[PDB]
């Protein structure tokens, strides 16, 4: 036997980025566990938030900017 | 008094607000706030409930999964 490298496409989600999960026919002892593994892999591909911007394009760089008047912000990853 | 912040993820579709509840006192650093938002985003990523082949058949068991196809589509709730 050999492990299987599956490619997962998230329904409706853009940009179109493949999520790869390695599953073993003799390890995955449950279909629900496969779904959990896929769920974790999707969560892992979430880029960590590195920057924040106001709607008008100013970078939010400190706690003071963050607790001002605006309560809507744009998050950018890497 | 806690602040309810709406985060919009850049370039991500569909357009779904991520809300984070933050307190000016409890938030110790700006990095802490970025981490709490990152965690909030990962949480709102729905748990995968159904899988489908490209052609439209639901994959519902281990045997369907270890067939010949190796590309699938995930659906949440």
């Amino acid at each position: 036997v050999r492990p299987k490298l599956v490619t997962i496409i998230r329904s409706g989600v853009k940009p179109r980025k493949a999520v790869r999960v390695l599953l073993n026919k003799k390890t995955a002892h449950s279909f629900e566990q496969v779904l959990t593994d896929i769920t974790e892999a999707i969560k892992l591909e979430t880029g960590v938030v590195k920057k924040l911007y106001t709607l008008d394009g100013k970078q939010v760089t400190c706690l003071h900017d963050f607790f001002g008047d605006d309560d809507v912000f744009i998050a950018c990853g890497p | 008094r806690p602040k309810l912040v709406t985060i919009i993820r850049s370039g991500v579709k569909p357009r779904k607000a991520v809300r984070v509840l933050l307190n000016k006192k409890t938030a110790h650093s700006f990095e802490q706030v970025l981490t709490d938002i990152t965690e909030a985003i990962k949480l709102e990523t729905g748990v995968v409930k159904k899988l489908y082949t490209l052609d439209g058949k639901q994959v519902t068991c281990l045997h369907d999964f270890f067939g010949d196809d190796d590309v699938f589509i995930a659906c949440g709730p």
């Binding site: 329904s11 409706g12 | 489908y52 490209l54 052609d55 439209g56 589509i73």
Partner: peptide
């Protein structure tokens, strides 16, 4: 262009 989902 192939197209499918859901």
């Amino acid at each position: 262009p192939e197209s499918s989902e859901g």
